[PDB]
């Protein structure tokens, strides 16, 4: 819906507003936490998905990454922030809708991905970030069909 689109835009920009007061060190940590969370959610979804469904989505990520290459650093920074805020919206929902147990394993699953991400080189680290941004833009584009 258009009225449904407008509500999600407000939420994204509202979430971004809480980011303005946080510090570059806090913001770096939030960015890294968001990435790790998208990664566990990615991994979990690849289990429950087909060999063909995994090819189709992998190419969806790549086509999205190609659109990003077409954009200016200003737009790319904007896009990066929208995705991060949109993920933070879900993390808010997630934080309310599950109890201390489900919260627990997720934190651990987050912690592993952060560990896995720290062990990577800088080129690969940058590559994972961008794929995570592209993937969220993918599912964001699917949801933005309703
Ligand atoms: Cl970026
Ligand atoms: Na690496």
Q: Which residues contact 46 (CB under 8 A, 6 or more apart)?
A: 54
CA of 115 to the centre of ligand 2 (A): 13
Distance (Å) from CA 130 to ligand 1 centroid: 7
Q: Give the burial class of 73: count Cβ atoms within 10 A of its Cβ; 0-12 exposed, 13-18 middle, 19 or more buried.
A: exposed
Tell me if 142 sits within 8 A of 86, measured CB to CB. Answer: no
Q: Is the dihedral of CA 136, 138, 140, 142 positive or negative?
A: negative
CA–CA–CA angle 4, 31, 86 (5° rounding): 5
Structure tokens at 58: 């992998």
Distance 136 CA to ligand 2 centre (A): 22
Residue 98 C-alpha to ligand 2 middle, in angstroms?
A: 34
Cα 29 to middle of ligand 2, angstroms: 20
Say if CB 35 and CB 129 are below 8 A apart. yes
- Measured in angstroms, the resolution is 2.5
């Amino acid at each position: 819906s258009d009225e449904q689109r407008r509500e999600l835009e407000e939420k994204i920009k509202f979430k971004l507003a809480e980011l303005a007061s946080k510090s570059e060190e806090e913001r770096k940590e939030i960015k890294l936490r968001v990435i790790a969370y998208v990664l566990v959610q990615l991994e979990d979804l690849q289990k429950n998905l087909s060999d063909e469904q995994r090819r189709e989505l992998e190419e969806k990520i790549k086509f999205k990454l190609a659109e990003l290459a077409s954009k200016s650093e200003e737009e790319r920074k904007e896009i990066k922030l929208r995705v991060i805020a949109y993920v933070l919206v879900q993390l808010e929902d997630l934080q309310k809708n599950l109890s201390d147990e489900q919260r627990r394993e997720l934190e651990e699953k987050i912690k592993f991905k952060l560990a896995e991400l720290a062990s990577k080189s800088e080129e690969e680290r940058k590559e994972i970030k961008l794929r995570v941004i592209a993937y969220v833009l993918v599912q964001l584009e699917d949801l933005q069909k309703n």
